[PDB]
């Protein structure tokens, strides 16, 4: 198979497809609540800028490398999204995946509307994000963390990027929920993730697909996503304050 790795069995069916325990029932909640979030900046020591984001069952680590050599008059922004194999129900192929490339592009088309590349001619920035655990809304964490990393690494941006997530209940009276989990996401019909700049009041990225076809549900999904991005901001406000207080006090 692969000549750059250790070869094992040719085929391997995971025991979930043989799991004799039938799928359970998620439950119910209040759709006007947010999972408590803890944010830390400046984690890694050998990286120019890094951040680690954890909230509930989600574990994502983001690090930012500095500008390197090689729309010029402007600098590029390389991106790379990759998630840990030990995340989720099943294992994943190390070489890659179409899902990883789609989410990498959904990240790239969302963090460039914030930084001003008209200050780095002929240079380029590389951003790497890693998901240690998938326990809820993921794209609402790969955006917040990769923006926090950029802000702690001293690159010039117009504003931050704060993400959120939503999902649609499958009942006869569906209602959108805020910060869904895997028990509330694999049983859902549609999902929406928004990327809002809280001060400039401009939507940075949008993505959504599913079974909701009336153009009156998406207005609430969008505007509660905007309320989520305006309610997650203060924690990231005090996180960069503490990060800069410690970095400056370290001199």
């Amino acid at each position: 198979g692969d000549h750059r790795r250790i070869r094992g069995p040719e085929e391997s069916q995971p025991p979930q497809l043989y799991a004799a325990d039938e799928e359970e029932a998620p439950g119910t909640r209040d759709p006007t609540r947010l999972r408590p979030v803890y944010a830390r900046a400046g984690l890694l020591s050998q990286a120019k800028g890094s951040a680690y984001l954890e909230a509930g069952g989600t574990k994502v680590l983001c690090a930012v490398s500095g500008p390197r050599q090689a729309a010029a008059l402007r600098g590029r922004l390389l991106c790379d999204f990759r998630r840990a194999p030990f995340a989720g129900r099943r294992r994943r192929a190390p070489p890659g995946g179409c899902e990883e490339r789609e989410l990498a592009l959904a990240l790239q088309e969302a963090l460039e509307p914030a930084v001003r590349l008209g200050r780095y001619p002929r240079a380029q920035l590389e951003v790497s994000a890693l998901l240690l655990e998938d326990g809820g809304s993921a794209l609402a964490a790969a955006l917040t963390a990769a923006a926090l990393a950029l802000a702690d690494a001293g690159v010039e941006m117009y504003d931050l990027v704060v993400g959120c997530g939503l999902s649609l209940a499958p009942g006869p009276a569906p209602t959108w929920l805020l910060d869904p989990t895997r028990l509330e996401e694999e049983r859902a019909a549609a999902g929406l993730t928004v990327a809002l700049m809280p001060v400039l009041n401009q939507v940075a990225g949008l993505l959504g697909s599913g079974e909701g076809g009336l153009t009156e549900s998406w207005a609430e999904a969008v505007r509660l996503g905007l309320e989520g991005c305006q309610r997650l901001y203060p924690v990231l406000q005090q996180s960069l304050v503490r990060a800069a207080r410690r970095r400056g006090a370290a001199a």
Partner: protein
């Protein structure tokens, strides 16, 4: 303990700068070296050269194991090659396995040493290859064969200098204690004195 049949041939191929086939018993390895030549700008280093080592097996395609055994040979040649005399150039050593009968890494190191010497590369001291394989009881055997290698519980291979007989390279297979590690190191130090005599006798005869 007794080293098995030894053989060597020099200047086989006409295209390279120096060629040397070294077969010890049934196993055999062929090697050739191109002298200091131009190097890609993206890999060049100032005040030093750059060493490239590639090994080709007979069955399959090289994988992680063969490059992991390429690192040892490159980091062994790096300690005996005076790169400072030739900066902004490249020296490459390639080893080819023709036949395998046991103790292949030692014969590859000896092939590399004889190919570098024939190719005319500045050297600080020559190096040798000796492999030990103690049996299930503790009876040491030097330069073993794959028949004895399959039953044996531990195989060790060492590379030794040609000046004060220190230790350069060490790759070990199997589990053991330190006492027989010391006794196989001493056996290797005793064994290299005949291989170095083969080097000296071969080069004294070559310039007759």
């Amino acid at each position: 303990c007794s080293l098995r049949h030894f053989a060597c041939e020099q200047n086989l191929l006409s295209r390279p700068d120096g060629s040397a086939s070294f077969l010890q018993g049934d196993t055999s390895v062929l090697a050739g070296v191109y002298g200091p030549a131009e190097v890609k700008v993206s890999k060049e280093i100032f005040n030093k050269a750059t060493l490239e080592v590639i090994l080709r097996p007979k069955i399959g395609l090289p994988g992680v194991a063969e490059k992991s055994r390429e690192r040892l040979i490159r980091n062994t040649c790096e300690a005996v090659v005076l790169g400072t005399l030739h900066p902004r150039t490249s020296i490459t050593v390639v080893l080819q396995v023709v036949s395998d009968a046991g103790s292949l890494l030692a014969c590859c190191l000896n092939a590399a040493c004889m190919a570098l010497v024939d190719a005319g590369v500045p050297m600080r001291a020559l190096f040798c290859g000796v492999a030990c394989a103690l049996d299930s009881d503790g009876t040491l055997v030097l330069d073993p064969t794959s028949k004895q290698e399959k039953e044996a519980r531990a195989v060790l291979t060492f590379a030794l200098d040609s000046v004060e007989r220190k230790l350069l390279m060490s790759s070990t297979k199997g589990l053991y204690s330190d006492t027989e590690l010391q006794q196989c190191l001493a056996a290797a130090q005793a064994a290299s004195q005949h291989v170095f005599r083969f080097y000296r006798e071969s080069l004294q005869r070559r310039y007759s």
